[PDB]
């Protein structure tokens, strides 16, 4: 979880972040000072809700968006099946578009993507006006257990 964007990934330029807690997306367009190796905690790190450690400051804020999570996938059914989440991020003329589509997988081999046609339905449109030149992803590591 997490797709922070930025021109140089520091407090002097605005940045994005896509954090799905359990039921929200928390879209935040603000100036953030980022740690060297930001990460999160899968098991809510106990807490309360004290996992967030990506940013250490916020000088200014311009855009906010909270809604249902991008991930409708649920693992509570059973195991033996993995996910095939797909996203395309396109940023033009001061707009940010997100497309998504999920399908189940049968073969346990992760070496190659399965051969099959998939249509990526549009999900959400963003009116923010940031420049993006670098890409960074985030991870959820609660504890070694």
């Amino acid at each position: 979880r997490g797709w922070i964007f930025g021109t140089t990934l520091d407090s002097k330029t605005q940045s994005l972040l896509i954090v799905n807690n359990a039921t929200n997306v928390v879209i935040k367009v603000c100036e953030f000072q980022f740690c060297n190796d930001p990460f999160l905690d899968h098991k809510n790190n106990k807490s309360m809700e004290s996992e967030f450690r990506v940013y250490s400051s916020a000088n200014n804020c311009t855009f906010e968006y909270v809604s249902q999570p991008f991930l409708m996938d649920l693992e509570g059914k059973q195991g033996n099946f993995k996910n095939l989440r797909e996203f395309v991020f396109k940023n033009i003329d001061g707009y940010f578009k997100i497309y998504s589509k999920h399908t189940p997988i049968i073969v346990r081999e992760p070496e190659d993507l399965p051969q099959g046609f998939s249509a990526l339905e549009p999900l959400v449109d963003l009116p923010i006006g940031i420049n993006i030149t670098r890409f960074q992803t985030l991870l959820a590591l609660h504890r070694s257990y």
Binding site: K12, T13, N60, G94, Y95, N131
Partner: protein, 50 residues
């Protein structure tokens, strides 16, 4: 002195895009290091309405 505007920038802007950066613009080859008077200018100059 509450309304500012930008005068010098490296490149043209893309449509419907916003900048807020406040960094010294270098018109000369020599670096400015944030403080200089020759070939280095502060990007923003304020309005003054009377």
């Amino acid at each position: 002195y509450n309304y500012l505007y930008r005068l010098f920038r490296k490149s043209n802007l893309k449509p419907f895009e916003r900048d807020i950066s406040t960094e010294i613009y270098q018109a000369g080859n020599k670096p400015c290091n944030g403080v200089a008077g020759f070939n280095c200018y502060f990007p923003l100059r304020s309005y003054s309405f009377r």
